[PDB]
RNA sequence: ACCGGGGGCAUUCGUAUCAUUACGCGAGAGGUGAAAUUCGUGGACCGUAGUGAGACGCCCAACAGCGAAAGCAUUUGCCAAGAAUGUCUUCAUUAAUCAAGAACGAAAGUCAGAGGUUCGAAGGCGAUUAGAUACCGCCCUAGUUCUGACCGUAAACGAUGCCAUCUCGCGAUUCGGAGGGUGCCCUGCCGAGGAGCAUCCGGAAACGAAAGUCUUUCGGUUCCGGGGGUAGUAUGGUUGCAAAG
RNA sequence: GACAUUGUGAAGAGUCAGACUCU
RNA sequence: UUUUUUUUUU
């Protein structure tokens, strides 16, 4: 729980990522998404869509313990993030 | 004319190809796009309509059915709710506590909605202006403004008349008084400010 | 004489106890719609384990509830258990920590029993320290151990076996021997046992009981 | 500059209706004219439409809430009780 | 003039101590300040133990005991003579008196 | 009138002895406690209210109770001592010992003695003021 | 309960003085 | 396997008090120095078994612990925080005390909404008395309880400001550590607490291991006093709904 | 309150000599 | 259980 915050911070500082539903979908389609993180207030339809995409692409989905406001705060941004895709763990152990 | 919002809910007819719309007073927290489950096997969620027999003691409910099938008659005003006090499986009955503080026994199959009626806290803001009362009652019925009986003449009211504005007789009248006489504190068990709990 | 209307009945305890003779009760004879047997059904009698099993556990008290009447015989069944006030007051001592617990355990025949356990920290043999206190975290651990042990003992049995285990207070001794790993315990007892939920009266089962 | 020292929103009432009544009306007037964080989209876009009806400007969700507050304390406790019973 | 070094209490490392109601007067007194007495007695007075034993329905019965913890305020303790005033030097003695 | 004793059997009743500082009750019941054989109080024996709790009044009440118990065939008594309890005093009044000794002397066999004073885990506020009874 | 009563007396006097000044 | 009644929110349990239901009883019960008011054959009080409400967490419970102080004690879950100890970890003077300024702050009290068991100001009765607007007894209203706001005062006391440093012996106690023996014992063990009795010096004395190391005055710093009253009064200012600060 | 609408069974109590009365 | 007072100076 508290570990994913530190791992996400390390990814934001060193790794590569895309914040947002559209880029997450594109990254899943083109297969450069190592992990997908979803806020807990994500719309149910969007959640099911992203999980279906992740099942197709054989990628892991992590249901963050917080809504998009807190997910954005964890990402270190001043806006809301409801979905994000980590494409390169960088110097973190988020993928595992 | 109603202080509590209404919920328009759409159900599917089980016997023909049609949609049936239901208008019920909304429980607080209900939102558009929500799913309401009504029946004996529905779970304990806000907005579900379930028999009172299935609920645990202390549950708060609204739209309670006084008699099985009357379609919800109790605890319908904004912010109000009844509570499930007890069960008796042998007689298949449930004791509930009404908003007024009374306790009533109902059949365990009487349906109710889980939650309390939305719009609570309405009668906390003063109606600072008389125009607000005017608009409030223009949407309900003709019951305003209210003229005091002592301000009338003795022809139109038991309290009217006199060289001083006074009732002249005790204002507590018996229950079986006639139609034109039954004004004031009807069948009052007591009067005056309530010092203690009642 | 107002006592002329009273008929005397004989109280009979179930077969967990050696002495099945408890004592004699009384009630007005049947008159009109008031039936003596119906009136007797439901009475509660408080007896001592000294008067039931003649064992040294005189301080253990048992409540027996009458569920049936046959002729002039009132068949009773276990209703509640409690320790004696004198025993509890004697047990409570200063400079020691008192550990209390209670748990709701379900038997295999539908009886939910709340069991109240009491224990005290023991002095070591070669102890110079006047007090025998311990850390509150250890108190919590010991309390959890007692609850778990009571659950293990009760769950899986039925009312007859749990009453049989209460009669000698085997459970108390097993606690005093098992939970003492964290801190040696003394004067561990099942202070009380009460019935939260009970099944419907089964006259058939009461007969095997009597 | 701060235009009113203490009356705030109820400055529309001038010197009418009594200080205590205006003070009581102030809390609920502020509450009913405030904007609240929506629990569905997470943006501060919930506004009162009518007494008990709260609409979100962004996700267009309509919620049945309090007369002057988006959510009431009693409703919160009832929700907590239902969730607790569900968990245990 | 300060009469006692402890100011009549047993409060150290503490701000507030809950009170108890005296046994006789019912007055509220802090628990550290109240005179406490643990009394263990026979349930039956000494002069009737033989009578109860000879009337016993059992061959050998152990007569129970009464345990009472009594709390007294200073006034109702001095009046009842549970505690007495002492000389200036004897005031500092803290050992319980012989029983 | 009474039960059928088996040639030396001890017929047991229960004697609830409520010994407050204003009165004393000697109340005989069955083992269940739901039926009362006989009850006598100190006020029934003494005219003056000041002596309702007197040891002599307790003794007289116990003697009458013993006579009635013998008439009805009860010959043994399980004692149940009691004080006011609750928020009030927990010590038995002055009539308890007199009543118990009087029963024993009368001849009723004495079974188990127990104290059943109502004692709280914690209480409602006591009667007196915060300053107590100043008299 | 000798100076506290003087405080009460002066508080009553100050109440009367306030009322008169109004 | 840290320590703790430290804080918050939910939750569990316990007898007791009161009310009430069923059954038995039979005339008193209650209360006092003695009584009376009061309750009671419409069957009280007393027993046994239930039911409901609200309050409160006995015993364990201590010259014990925690917290800035006020204060803090039924079980369990969750939440954030913290002391001491350990440290061959890190930064490198970032510190002490603090006008103005700000948070918290017992009880009573005020406002609003719920609850209203117990106790209970005011009030009303019964006593006592020369009187008794009291002590005693009976019935009680606000209040006492919960939630959200106000007030900012207590013998809020250790009647002793905070930081650093030096000066005595003894054996106990709470927490952590080190070393041994079998949770307990030992180590004239090491720190940190909270104390007690051998106490130099001090003090008008009572007394104080600080209230000592001050005419041999001088480590730093904040607040306060200047014979008793008038008087924490008048007036002005400011805060508060008021009471009042 | 009485009578009629008002029917079909049980248990208790009381009257009678299988009926009646009540609850 | 009840039990209030004792002019001024010396």
A7: enclosing H helix or E strand: helix A2-14
Dist. CA A94–CA F47, nearest whole Å:
92
| CA dist., res. A54 & res. A86, Å (int) | 13
Measuring CA to CA, how many Å separate B42 from each of B55, C73, E55? Answer: 11, 50, 68
C-alpha neighbours within 13 Å on the C-beta side of residue E69: 11
Nearest to C176 by CA among C144, C146, C155: C146
For F113, the closest of E25, E45, E63 (CB atoms) is: E63
Strands D44-50 and D36-37 turn out to be antiparallel
Nucleotide nearest to C31 (CA to C1'): I12
Q: Is B85 helix (H, G, I), strand (E, B) or coil?
A: strand
Name the DSSP letter for residue B26. P
Sign of CA dihedral D28, D32, D35, D37: positive
CB B39 within 8 A of CB B58: no
Chain D CB within 8 Å of residue A69 CB: yes
Reported for D78-87, long-range contacts at CB under 8 A and 24+ positions apart, including other chains, are: D78/B46, D78/B60, D78/B115, D78/B116, D79/B29, D79/B46, D81/B58, D81/B59, D81/B60, D82/B44, D82/B45, D82/B46, D82/B114, D85/B44, D85/B56, D86/B44
Those residues whose C-beta lies under 8 Å from the C-beta of residue C104, and which sit 6 or more positions away, are C112, C113, C114, C196
Q: Which of B81, B119, B129 sits opposite D52 (nearest CB)?
A: B119
| Of the partner residues D25, D50, D72, the one whose CB lies closest to the CB of residue B125 | D25
Measured CA to CA in angstroms, residue C118 lies from C11, C123, C149, F39 at distances of 31, 17, 13, 37
Find out whether C39 and C28 touch, Cβ atoms under 8 Å.
yes
Instruction: Please state, in angstroms and rounded to a whole number, the distance separating the CA atoms of residues C14 and C206.
Output: 8
For residue A82, the SS3 value is coil
B-interface mutation test, from D58, D67, D72, most B Cβ less than 10 A away: D67
In this structure, the dihedral spanned by the alpha carbons of residues E81, E83, E87 and E88, taken in order and rounded to 10 degrees, is: -150
Picking from B90, B91, B89, B72, the residue whose alpha carbon sits closest to that of residue B81 is B72
- Is C45's CB within 8 Å of F1's CB? no
Pairwise CB contact (< 8 Å): E65 & C84? no
Here the contacts of D11-20 (C-beta below 8 Å, separation 24 or greater) are D13/B128, D16/B128, D17/B126, D17/B128, D17/B129
CB B41 within 8 A of CB B51: no
Angle at the Cα of C143 from the Cα atoms of C141 and C146, rounded to 5 degrees: 110
Q: How far apart are CA B73 and CA B99, in angstroms?
A: 12
Rounded Cα distance, B75 and B85, in Å: 15
Which is it for strands B111-114 and B60-62: parallel, antiparallel or unpaired? Answer: antiparallel
Q: Which of F64, F77, F96 lies closest to F31, judged by CA?
A: F77
Nearest-by-Cβ selection for B118 from D22, D28, D52: D52
Q: Please name the chains neighbouring E, where neighbouring means 3+ C-beta pairs under 8 angstroms.
A: C, F
> Which residue, among C194, C93, E58, has the nearest Cα to F113 in the 3D structure?
E58
Strand partners, F39: F27
**D79: exposed, middle or buried (C-beta count within 10 Å: 0-12, 13-18, 19+)?**
middle
Helix axes A2-14, A68-75, angle to 10 degrees: 50
Q: Please indicate whether, in this complex, the C-beta atoms of E26 and F89 are within 8 angstroms of each other.
A: no
Euclidean distance between CA atoms C121 and C183, whole angstroms? 7
- Residues of chain C that touch chain F, judged by Cβ-Cβ distance less than 8 Å: 1, 3-4, 6, 8, 11, 22-27, 43-48, 50-51, 58, 84-86
Gap between the Cα atoms of F119 and C89, Å rounded: 12
| Cβ-based neighbours of D62, under 8 Å, separated by 6 or more | B31, B32, D49, D53, D54, D55, D56
Rounded CA gap, B111 and E12, in Å? 62
- Interface contact flag, F30 C50, Cβ < 8 Å: no
Phi (first) and psi of residue C87, to 5 degrees: -60, -45
Q: What is the DSSP string of chain E?
A: ----TTTTS---S-S---EEE-SSS--EEETTTSEEEEEEEESS-GGGHHHHHHTBSSSS----EEEEEEEE-HHHHHHHTSS----TTGGG--SPPP-
DSSP B176: T
Under DSSP, the state recorded for C95 is T
What distance in Å separates the CA atoms of residue B66 and residue B54, rounded to the nearest whole number?
16
Rounded distance between C-alpha atoms, residue B182 and residue B186, angstroms = 7
Q: What are the chain B neighbours of D25 within 8 Å (beta carbons)? A: 125-126, 128
Q: In chain C, which residues have their Cβ closer than 8 Å to the Cβ of E66?
A: 86
Whether the link from the prior residue into B145 is cis, omega within 30° of 0, is yes
Question: Buried (b) or exposed (e) across C67-90, using 16+ Cβ within 10 A?
Answer: bbbeeeebbbbbbbbbbbbbbbbe
Distance between CA atoms of C113 and E68, rounded to whole angstroms?
A: 31
D 32-51 → A contacts, CB under 8 A: 39-43
Q: In angstroms, what separates the C-alpha of F13 from chain C's closest C-alpha?
A: 8
Report residue C29 as tokens.
């004879």
3-state secondary structure of A38: strand
Kindly list the residues from chain E whose CB atom is less than 8 angstroms away from the CB atom of residue C58. 62
How many CB atoms lie under 10 A from the CB of residue F81?
A: 24
State both tokens at C14: 């179930």
> Distance, in angstroms, between A91 CA and closest chain D CA?
31
* Locus of tokens 């293990």: C152
- The Cα B155–Cα C116 span in angstroms is 75
Q: Which residues contact F6 (CB under 8 A, 6 or more apart)?
A: none
Q: Is E60 on the interface with C (CB under 8 A)?
A: no
Q: What is the DSSP letter of A28?
A: H
Pinpoint the alpha helices (H) of chain D. Answer: 19-33, 73-87
DSSP state for residue C24 in the 8-state scheme: E
Among B33, B80, B118, B129, the strongest candidate for a mutation testing the D interface, having the largest count of D CBs within 10 A, is B118
- CB contacts of B46 in chain D (<8 Å) are 78-79, 82
Neighboring chain D residues of B28 at a CB cutoff of 8 Å: 64-66, 71-72, 75
| Contact partners, residue C202, CB within 8 Å, separation at least 6 | none
Residues with CB under 7 A from strand I: C 32-33
Q: Which residue is it, tokens 């406001």? A: A69
DSSP, residue by residue, F76-105? EEEEEEE---TTS--S--TTHHHHHHHHHH
- Quote the strand ranges of C60-155, DSSP E: 60-70, 73-83, 98-106, 112-121
D78, B117 Cβ separation under 8 angstroms: no
What secondary structure does DSSP assign to F25-58, as a single string? Answer: EEEEE-SSSSSEEEEEEHHHH-SSGGGTT-HHHH
F4 touches chain C (CB under 8 A): yes
Mutation to test the F interface, candidates C4, C25, C191, most F Cβ within 10 Å: C25
Q: How far is E65 from chain C, CA to nearest CA, in Å? A: 6
F25 conformational bin, left if phi > 0, alpha if psi -120 to 50, beta if neither: beta
Q: Containing H/E element for G2?
A: none
Cβ contact D79–B3 (<8 Å): no
End-to-end CA distance of chain D: 54
Q: Which of E71, E93, E92, E94 is nearest to E82 (CA)?
A: E71
Please answer whether residues E49 and E26 qualify as being in contact, where contact means their C-beta atoms are separated by less than 8 angstroms. no
Q: Would you say F61 and F40 are in contact if contact means Cβ atoms under 8 Å apart?
A: yes
Q: Which H or E run includes B11?
A: strand B6-12
The CA angle B51-B56-B58, to the nearest 5 degrees, is: 110
User: Residue C7 and residue E86: Cα distance in Å, rounded?
Assistant: 67
Compute CA C3 distance to the chain's CA centroid, rounded to the nearest angstrom: 34
Composition of chain D by helix, strand, coil, percent to 5: 40, 20, 40
Q: Is F25 within 8 Å of F53 (Cβ atoms)?
A: no
Geometric angle at alpha carbon C135, from C134 and C136, rounded to 5°? 120
Tell me the three state secondary structure of residue A78: coil
3-state secondary structure of D12: helix
Of C1, C24, C50, the CB nearest to F3: C24
In whole angstroms, give the CA distance from residue F3 to residue C183. Answer: 54
In chain E, what residues touch C94 (CB-CB under 8 Å)?
38
Tell me which residue of A34, A23, A33 sits closest to A82, measured CA to CA.
Answer: A23
The answer to whether some atom of strand H lies closer than 7 Å to the beta carbon of E24 is no
* CB-based contact B93:B106 (threshold 8 Å): yes
| Chain A interface disruption, residue of D42, D43, D58, most A CBs within 10 A | D42
Cα separation, D60 vs D63, whole angstroms? 10
Experimental method: cryo-EM
Distance CA C113, CA B169 (A): 64
Determine the angle formed by the axes of helices A44-57 and A21-29, rounding to 10 degrees: 20
Query: Is residue A48 classed as helix, strand or coil in its secondary structure?
Result: helix
B128 with D25: Cβ contact below 8 A = yes
Q: F131: burial class by Cβ within 10 Å (0-12, 13-18, 19+)? A: exposed
């Amino acid at each position: 729980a508290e570990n994913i915050n530190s791992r996400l911070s390390m990814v934001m500082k060193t790794g590569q990522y895309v914040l947002g539903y559209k880029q997450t979908l594109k990254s899943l389609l083109n297969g450069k998404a190592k992990l997908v993180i979803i806020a807990n207030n994500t719309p149910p339809l969007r959640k099911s869509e992203i999980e279906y995409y992740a099942m197709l692409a054989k990628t892991g989905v992590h249901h963050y313990n917080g809504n998009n406001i807190e997910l954005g705060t964890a990402c270190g941004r001043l806006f809301r993030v409801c979905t994000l895709a980590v494409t390169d763990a960088g110097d973190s152990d988020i993928i595992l | 004319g109603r202080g509590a919002p209404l919920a328009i809910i759409a159900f599917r007819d089980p016997y023909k190809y049609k949609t049936v719309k239901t208008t019920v007073v909304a429980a607080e927290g209900m939102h558009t796009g929500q799913f309401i489950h009504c029946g004996a096997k529905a779970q304990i969620q806000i907005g579900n309509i379930v028999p009172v027999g299935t609920l645990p003691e202390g549950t708060t409910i609204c739209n309670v059915e006084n008699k099985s099938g009357d379609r919800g008659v109790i605890a319908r005003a904004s912010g109000n709710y009844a509570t499930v006090i007890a069960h008796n499986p042998d007689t298949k009955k449930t004791r509930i506590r009404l908003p007024s503080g009374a306790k009533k026994v109902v059949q365990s199959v009487n349906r109710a909605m889980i939650g309390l009626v939305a719009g609570g806290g309405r009668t906390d803001k003063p109606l600072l202006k008389a125009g607000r009362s005017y608009h409030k009652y223009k949407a309900k019925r003709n019951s305003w403004p209210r003229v005091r009986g002592v301000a009338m003449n003795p022809v139109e009211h038991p309290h009217g008349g006199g060289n001083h504005q006074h009732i002249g007789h005790p204002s507590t009248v018996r229950r079986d008084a006639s139609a034109g006489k039954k004004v004031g504190l009807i069948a009052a068990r007591r009067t005056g400010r309530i010092r203690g709990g009642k | 004489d107002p006592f002329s209307r009273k008929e005397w009945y004989d109280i009979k305890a179930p077969n967990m106890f050696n002495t099945r003779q408890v004592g004699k009760t009384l009630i007005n004879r049947t008159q009109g719609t008031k039936i003596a047997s119906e009136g007797l059904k439901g009475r509660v009698f408080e007896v001592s384990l000294g008067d039931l099993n003649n064992s040294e556990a005189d301080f253990r008290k048992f409540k027996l509830i009458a569920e049936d009447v046959q002729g002039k015989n009132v068949l009773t069944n276990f209703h509640a258990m409690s320790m004696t006030h004198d025993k509890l007051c004697s047990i409570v001592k200063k400079w020691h920590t008192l550990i209390e617990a209670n748990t709701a355990v379900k038997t295999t025949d539908g009886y939910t029993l709340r069991v109240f356990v009491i224990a005290f920290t023991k002095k070591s043999v070669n102890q110079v320290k006047k007090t025998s206190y311990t850390k509150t975290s250890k108190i919590r651990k010991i309390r959890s151990e007692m609850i778990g042990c009571i659950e293990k003992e009760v769950t899986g049995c039925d009312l007859k076996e749990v009453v049989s285990k209460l009669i000698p207070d085997s459970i108390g001794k097993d606690i005093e021997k098992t939970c003492s790993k964290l801190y040696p315990l003394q004067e561990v007892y099942i202070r009380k046992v009460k019935i939260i939920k009970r099944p419907k009266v089964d006259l058939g089962r009461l007969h095997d009981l009597h | 500059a701060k235009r009113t020292k203490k009356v705030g929103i109820v400055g529309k009432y001038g010197t009418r209706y009594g200080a205590s009544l205006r003070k009581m009306a102030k809390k609920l007037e502020v509450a009913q004219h405030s904007r609240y964080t929506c629990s569905f989209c997470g943006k501060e876009a919930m506004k009162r439409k009518a007494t008990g009806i709260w609409n979100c400007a962004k996700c267009h969700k309509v919620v049945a809430g309090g007369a002057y507050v988006y959510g009431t304390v009693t409703a919160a406790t009832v929700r907590s009780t239902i969730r607790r019973l569900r968990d245990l | 003039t300060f009469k006692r070094r402890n100011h009549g209490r047993n409060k150290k490392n503490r701000g507030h101590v809950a009170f108890i109601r005296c046994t006789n007067c019912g007055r509220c007194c802090p628990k550290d300040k109240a005179i406490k007495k643990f009394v263990v007695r026979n349930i039956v007075e000494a002069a009737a133990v033989r009578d109860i034993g000879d009337a016993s329905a059992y061959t050998q019965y152990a007569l129970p005991k009464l345990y009472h913890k009594l709390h007294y305020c200073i006034a109702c303790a001095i009046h009842s003579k549970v505690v007495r005033n002492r000389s200036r030097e004897a005031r500092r003695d803290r050992n319980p008196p012989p029983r | 009138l009474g039960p059928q004793a088996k040639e030396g059997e001890l017929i047991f009743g229960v004697a609830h002895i409520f010994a407050s500082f204003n009165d004393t009750f000697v109340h005989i019941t069955d083992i269940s406690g739901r039926e009362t054989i006989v009850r006598v109080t100190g006020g029934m024996k003494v005219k003056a209210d000041r002596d309702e709790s007197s040891p002599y009044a307790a003794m007289l009440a116990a003697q009458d109770v013993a006579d009635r118990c013998k008439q009805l065939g009860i010959n043994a008594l399980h004692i149940k001592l009691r004080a006011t309890g609750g928020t009030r005093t927990k010590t038995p009044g002055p009539g308890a010992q007199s009543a118990l000794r009087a029963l024993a002397r009368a001849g009723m066999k004495i079974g188990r003695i127990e104290d059943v004073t109502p004692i709280p885990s914690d209480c409602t506020r006591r009667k007196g003021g915060r300053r107590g009874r100043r008299l | 309960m000798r100076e506290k009563w003087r405080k009460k007396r002066m508080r009553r006097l100050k109440r009367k003085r306030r009322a008169a000044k109004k």
